[PDB]
Every structure is written in structure tokens, then in C-alpha cells.
């Protein structure tokens, strides 16, 4: 089920793509996808 459709209260926003999150720990952990590289997909 859990897919997405979530965009309400979020102070932190990813400028790299334009994402958003409630806590920095989440955003700062997502921005690593672009600047960084983990798995062989994404
Ligand atoms: Zn992003």
C-alpha cells in the first residue's frame, strides 16, 4: 500500500530535486541519493 501522495507540513525541502520532509534527518538522508550513490538503481 504505502506508496506516496504525501505533501503537507514539511519545513525541510530538497532543492536538488524538490522533495520535502518533516525532519532534516530524513531530507539530509535523501539528498545523498543525488550527490552520493548507493545501490545500482536510482
Ligand atoms: Zn532530492
Swiss-Prot record:
Record comment regarding domains: The BTB domain mediates homodimerization. Its dimer interface mediates peptide binding such as to corepressors BCOR and NCOR2. Interaction with corepressors through the BTB domain is needed to facilitate the rapid proliferation and survival of GC B-cells but is not involved in the T(FH) formation and BCL6-mediated suppression of T(H)2 and T(H)17 differentiationrequired for GC formation.
The record's account of how the chain is modified after translation: Phosphorylated by ATM in response to genotoxic stress. Phosphorylation induces its degradation by ubiquitin/proteasome pathway.
Zinc finger boundaries on the chain: C2H2-type: 12-34
Gene from which the chain derives: BCL6
Organism: Homo sapiens (Human)
Compartments reported by the entry: Nucleus
Superkingdom per UniProt: Eukaryota
Subunit structure: Homodimer. Interacts (via BTB domain) with the corepressors BCOR, NCOR1 and SMRT/NCOR2; the interactions are direct. Forms preferably ternary complexes with BCOR and SMRT/NCOR2 on target gene promoters but, on enhancer elements, interacts with SMRT/NCOR2 and HDAC3 to repress proximal gene expression. Interacts with histone deacetylases HDAC2, HDAC5 and HDAC9 (via the catalytic domain). Interacts with ZBTB7 and BCL6B. Interacts with SCF(FBXO11) complex; the interaction is independent of phosphorylation and promotes ubiquitination.
Inducing stimuli: Down-regulated during maturation of dendritic cells by selective stimuli such as bacterial lipopolysaccharides (LPS), CD40LG and zymosan. Protein levels decreases upon genotoxic stress in a dose- and time-dependent way.
Protein name: B-cell lymphoma 6 protein
Disease: Chromosomal aberrations involving BCL6 are a cause of B-cell non-Hodgkin lymphomas (B-cell NHL), including diffuse large B-cell lymphoma and follicular lymphoma. Approximately 40% of diffuse large B-cell lymphomas and 5 to 10% of follicular lymphomas are associated with chromosomal translocations that deregulate expression of BCL6 by juxtaposing heterologous promoters to the BCL6 coding domain. Translocation t(3;14)(q27;q32). Translocation t(3;22)(q27;q11) with immunoglobulin gene regions. Translocation t(3;7)(q27;p12) with IKZF1 gene 5'non-coding region.
Functional summary from the UniProt entry: Transcriptional repressor mainly required for germinal center (GC) formation and antibody affinity maturation which has different mechanisms of action specific to the lineage and biological functions. Forms complexes with different corepressors and histone deacetylases to repress the transcriptional expression of different subsets of target genes. Represses its target genes by binding directly to the DNA sequence 5'-TTCCTAGAA-3' (BCL6-binding site) or indirectly by repressing the transcriptional activity of transcription factors.
Tissue expression: Expressed in germinal center T- and B-cells and in primary immature dendritic cells.
